[PDB]
Design a protein around this ligand. Sequence first.
Ligand SMILES: Cc1ncc(C[n+]2csc(CCOP(=O)(O)OP(=O)(O)O)c2C)c(N)n1
Ligand SMILES: Cc1ncc(C[n+]2csc(CCOP(=O)(O)OP(=O)(O)O)c2C)c(N)n1
Ligand SMILES: Cc1ncc(C[n+]2csc(CCOP(=O)(O)OP(=O)(O)O)c2C)c(N)n1
Ligand SMILES: [Mg+2]
Ligand SMILES: [Mg+2]
Ligand SMILES: [Mg+2]
Lengths: 553, 553, 553
Amino acid sequence: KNRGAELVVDCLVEQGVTHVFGIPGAKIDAVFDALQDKGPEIIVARHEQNAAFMAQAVGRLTGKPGVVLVTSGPGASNLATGLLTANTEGDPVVALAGNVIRADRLKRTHQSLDNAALFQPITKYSVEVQDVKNIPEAVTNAFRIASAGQAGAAFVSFPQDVVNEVTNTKNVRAVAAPKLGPAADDAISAAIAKIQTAKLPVVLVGMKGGRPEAIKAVRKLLKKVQLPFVETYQAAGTLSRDLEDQYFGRIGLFRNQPGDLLLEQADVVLTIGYDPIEYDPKFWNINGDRTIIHLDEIIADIDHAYQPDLELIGDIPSTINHIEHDAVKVEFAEREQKILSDLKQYMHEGEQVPADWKSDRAHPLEIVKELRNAVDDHVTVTCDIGSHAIWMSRYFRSYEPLTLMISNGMQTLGVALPWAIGASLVKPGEKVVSVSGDGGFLFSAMELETAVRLKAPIVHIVWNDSTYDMVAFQQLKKYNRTSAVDFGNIDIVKYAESFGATGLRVESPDQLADVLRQGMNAEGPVIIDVPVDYSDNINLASDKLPKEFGELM
Amino acid sequence: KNRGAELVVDCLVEQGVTHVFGIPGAKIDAVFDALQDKGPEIIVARHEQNAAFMAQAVGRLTGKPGVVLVTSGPGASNLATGLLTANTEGDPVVALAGNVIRADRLKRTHQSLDNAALFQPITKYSVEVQDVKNIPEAVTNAFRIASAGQAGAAFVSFPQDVVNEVTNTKNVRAVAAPKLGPAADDAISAAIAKIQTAKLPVVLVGMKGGRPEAIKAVRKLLKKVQLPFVETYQAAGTLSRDLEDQYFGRIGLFRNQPGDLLLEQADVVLTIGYDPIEYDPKFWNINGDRTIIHLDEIIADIDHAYQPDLELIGDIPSTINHIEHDAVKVEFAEREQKILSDLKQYMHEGEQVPADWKSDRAHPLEIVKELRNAVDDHVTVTCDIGSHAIWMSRYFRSYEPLTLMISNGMQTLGVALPWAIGASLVKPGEKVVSVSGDGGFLFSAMELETAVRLKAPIVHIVWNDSTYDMVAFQQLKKYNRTSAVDFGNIDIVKYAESFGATGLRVESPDQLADVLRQGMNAEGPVIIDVPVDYSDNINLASDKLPKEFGELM
Amino acid sequence: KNRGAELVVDCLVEQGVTHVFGIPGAKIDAVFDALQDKGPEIIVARHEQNAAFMAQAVGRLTGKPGVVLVTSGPGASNLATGLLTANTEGDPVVALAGNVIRADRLKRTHQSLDNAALFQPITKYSVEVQDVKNIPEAVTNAFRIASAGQAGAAFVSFPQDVVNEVTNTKNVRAVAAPKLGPAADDAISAAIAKIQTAKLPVVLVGMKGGRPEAIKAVRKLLKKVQLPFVETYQAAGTLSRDLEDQYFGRIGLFRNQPGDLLLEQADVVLTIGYDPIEYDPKFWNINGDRTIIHLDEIIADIDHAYQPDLELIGDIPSTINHIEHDAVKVEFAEREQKILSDLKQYMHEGEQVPADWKSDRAHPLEIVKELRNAVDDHVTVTCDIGSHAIWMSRYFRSYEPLTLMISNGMQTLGVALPWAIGASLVKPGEKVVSVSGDGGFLFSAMELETAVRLKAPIVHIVWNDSTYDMVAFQQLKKYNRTSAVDFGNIDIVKYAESFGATGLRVESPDQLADVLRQGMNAEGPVIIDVPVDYSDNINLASDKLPKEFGELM
Ligand SMILES: Cc1ncc(C[n+]2csc(CCOP(=O)(O)OP(=O)(O)O)c2C)c(N)n1
Ligand SMILES: Cc1ncc(C[n+]2csc(CCOP(=O)(O)OP(=O)(O)O)c2C)c(N)n1
Ligand SMILES: Cc1ncc(C[n+]2csc(CCOP(=O)(O)OP(=O)(O)O)c2C)c(N)n1
Ligand SMILES: [Mg+2]
Ligand SMILES: [Mg+2]
Ligand SMILES: [Mg+2]
């Protein structure tokens, strides 16, 4: 029809977008109309927050920007947290939003605000198009900027008259953002030299080390050089079953893990795609004096506790390959071998249900174990935020890239189920597993209607305790009292059923394996109610292990 | 304990705040701890969005800022829409949010962002406190600005170390924002003179004419001077059964109502507390030279279609009282009486179900009528956004200030149920009615747990059609096709039941009266499923009436 | 012609603007072109900064916004300090700036930036017009907001294509911002009662008390009730020769003046149009409980040291008149008479050159005295920032509204000379005196070419010491050493002459009176070089007086 709206759809077509997540409204209507003629499939969301989470999941899983499309005013403002989350967790997302006509842009008029100014602090790129001619340029740059390292959120606002205006404007080529080359040669050489001369060189795999191509490169380096390593939460899946012996767990949240003690003992740390948001360096880079090699697609943030002696800036997998090719196996002296062994044993003890445990409900580690054992390595598992997520982030092994998805920048409640829906669209023919607490579940559970409507093969595990627990035990640790953490319980089975989904319940802890398998074999979306005992949770913040290990040394 | 957190709580105590809506988190924990010792009762929300909506309703109902308290990062960013909606709909709200420690404010660290920069474009006042001493000043000023005409949102962010820091800083007195005097005497005199000389002076009652004290003054003026009048949606409740003959209904959305024709025929229009966001002056102030008198607490926005001949700026009720005191009854000539008379007849016809109507579902006007007949004058009714809300906004009579609440600034989906919860807390012991479509219902339906937890006597009416209808019929008018408006239906009765609420269904249109009454007579929260036939909705945007009236003229 | 540019000019004509200060450039050309056909006279500045200062002076002097017109990029950005200064000193200014065409607004292209975002934090109103039809609305609203209390800066940006676009858009009426009524009667009565019952009530005249209409009202109040009073620097001109006995000087900068001690001894303080930027309440409102009555056009800022017991909010002059009408003469008991008398003696001693003074250069007080004696009451005197301005702000009497202009919000160097040029344009045919130090002189001395071109009868007094002295003596008090306060001297006489102006020099202190008079009797701009001895400056910050009065008490 030659409107600005058609230019928007044309960009989405050129970009290879297959799904647009959105909710329509008057100001953005023409784009939704143009999408009836051609373009990506519209996935109708039940809340713009969830459309944004779904777009985030697509960006994380495909490396190409998830797309969310909304109307003016509350349509756009409902995107705030979603875009903020994607923008701090390395996920490319392009948001497209309506606004009032240019002529009324300054007025007190229905659903008008400064769209661009609102998204400026929470996006890589936030613009409003004020001439129909500029649409293909603004949108194309939005895609490129969202994808370029470090990937993030891009926001483009369209005044209603701009998307409705008839124009003879041409589209532009979807010029793909090009990758950087590997880090400079002298820097690669210096890193190899730092690793070979080290008493105990260790690898810290972070956010951008968790991409598939980076994991593949990391694995070769780890196997050849036989470096011990650790994961941040978003680096989950770096581990392969072959590397279990060199693996020292997931660091984060509280400094009391074997990975912390390993990092303390290292004299050289090679960090890969490390965004410190996942775990501030003031937590691990302590004790004193150790070499930091910072390997990433962008330069490091300088911190009191993070002053890289060496920066290898460039494309991450290429850089890792250069190191791998010329580095040789590292030989450990006996002192360090013993250290590695002890930490490995402490690690194994940390993963066990306590000897003095008895309960009418499952221990978190029982839920983790049974879940891991009922789900194939290749199945994508998404996780929400809370005490369950501490357990999952630490103890749920993952062995394939992008099969354990966690919000570890913004720690945003409600992401798990919509992430799973985004995942299922990206992985047709595959089950997707989502895990949340009961608090976070209701943040986005209305999107279960979307899952049912799509007949998505999603299995949602709700850890049921009836509190905002992650807040609660930290409150007890600081103040010895809780505040605003209690709510009533709902019937999760019947909630599921009211949406036309399947609802299951682990009625007693011994039924865990059977019910989980039943979910994996059920038709359509499943919600599983899993009662959990959280009395052991305060130990997630316990300082026993760093003290024990300190006495040993 | 004497922390910054105690200073925050002391301010709430001095402000006379009885309820704080919020969700705790690590960064804002100390304030929630301090609220255990004293201060307002904490209402735990199931989403910060709903906490903000609840605070908005308290603000609208009480004239004192509703208070919402949230943690850093996604805690704060989830407030965006809530605060924006309050900021543009005249509702005083104070938001208090946590942030990361000052030393790390610039870092990539968990849940960190420029809180103040984010809320700057969508609030009257958006600040971050960087010294514990400044807390009582920042908070007190936030309350005053939130309350001062025109009322809106204020946002205050606290870095974690600021609220945890021990200090001997003194509280400040809660100096209440003072009301203004009436508009200048000469402006009042001139306004009276222009009204007395008019062939057809009419009153347009707007957003700030909808406050109890303003409605009280407005009614005396209307009664004595015998002016025809019209309401904006947020002026609902201005009407008394005694003023029905002077009442030409609610204007808004589409220019096709008797109220539009009244305004066109007027030679003098007195607007009262008129925020043009409810209905742009370009829609009604057309086809002819006409005198505009702007009575408000703030100066007017100048528009092509709104250039006031006179501005009466000052305290609204006292200004109206000065006019009422010296104005006298207006005498209509026979020509103008017939105009008024004909418009009243057109109005009556518009409120009727068409004669050739037959359906297996309720007509929207049957739902409006039966609902109104089942609800006592004093009961607060909240409304959501959509086609249902158009029928309610036009045809649901209200006879008391603050008994029909509509989002007529941002038009935000999901407000109705959380608004009903806020209302129930402001008016303990009273039923509160909430009305939504099936689309908007799921935007906020998770807050049903809160309602059940409080044993709130809320009765929620769901208009069931299975689409985003308001978008849909407008798409058909423009494009002769819809886009992205379809979703599946959920079982509303079973949805309600899973929360421990009561679910009812109008299974056939003849049971509407009984089922409504059954809801009004139940204990605890009720959700009512009401099937509706929307085939007449397209006529809501029809130009038939202005055309018919044009020929008559 | 009927482009957007013509709509801009039509707005200036309707506003009654007689002078536009500006510098042309490609992006804003059309407006400058349109100004050749009709509208205000263009005054070409030699720097946009100075164009802003000149507009600020016009706003302060006329109460109608000074108007500045600049191009895109560095044209607009050169306005920052000027607008920031106007915006915090109560001066109405409207800035009109160009920008890049809409299509290229997001590009790296010559002179493009987000204009509106830049000016957002430093203006009352900062907007960009994106549709030619919106021009008349945006501009008219800019004038009203700049003028509305509290007056400040409004900024409007025009993309080049918007102002070059041919349009049938109509102008809008220049609807003048309406006056508020006085404060409410009950607040007035209460203030009168508190004043009558006071042992020692005093008036603090502030920024918005310095307007001609307010001073006029203030004078009646002070005369009838016989209240002692003090001025802030921007309240200069409140004094008349008849009120000298009730006059306790100008407060500000350092707490060591009779006015501070007066305020301390007072039990009731009526502040008038008080913006605390001129002197923070934490300096004067100390050592004891006292009643604060806040009289202003806007609500007060609540501070630890400022919690008004009463707020009288409304039109300032009317509110004062209402007080004056019903208040009666205050009777002082002997204790208070002695306090007042003691303070007048201290005040009189403070205005004298020390007896032990001997120097080969003038004492600051000799310059002040001689200048005052060489300048008629009506002549506007503008002042810069520095040690010279402390002497002037304290000791230069003014007897007429708007005849001593000081930057007491931002304290901006360089204002004096451009302010004098603005003044000379507001008051054609009158001499204007400008006073600066040698440091601030060069901040804006290039505008001397503008003064010479206009043949403006300006006499500029340069206090010559060869340092940034106000910084220097303050550095010595804190650190006992200076840093970066020294620069070389220029030949001020030759500087003046190179511009085609007259340069004079006070070669010895005894020629002070005659050289100044020689400047006042000269034709065209004159710069006067006056050597000054700053060895007594450190006493401006001396704590001597408050200690002596403390011992006396
Ligand atoms: C949007 C948002 N609000 C608040 C928080 C702070 N917060 C962290 S964990 C938590 C509660 C988690 O509760 P739940 O989902 O039931 O999981 P559980 O800890 O009980 O296993 C909250 C409110 C957050 N991370 N995100
Ligand atoms: C947060 C938000 N998203 C989108 C819109 C645009 N919008 C206006 S009405 C409507 C659909 C309402 O559907 P429903 O609640 O089922 O009521 P119905 O129209 O069917 O009566 C939408 C999506 C909006 N006003 N607010
Ligand atoms: C734009 C700007 N830069 C710096 C300052 C800081 N400052 C305040 S007073 C002063 C000294 C100015 O020296 P001068 O004009 O010669 O006056 P003097 O003190 O020597 O009389 C300075 C630099 C300022 N007020 N404004
Ligand atoms: Mg829980
Ligand atoms: Mg619907
Ligand atoms: Mg100097």
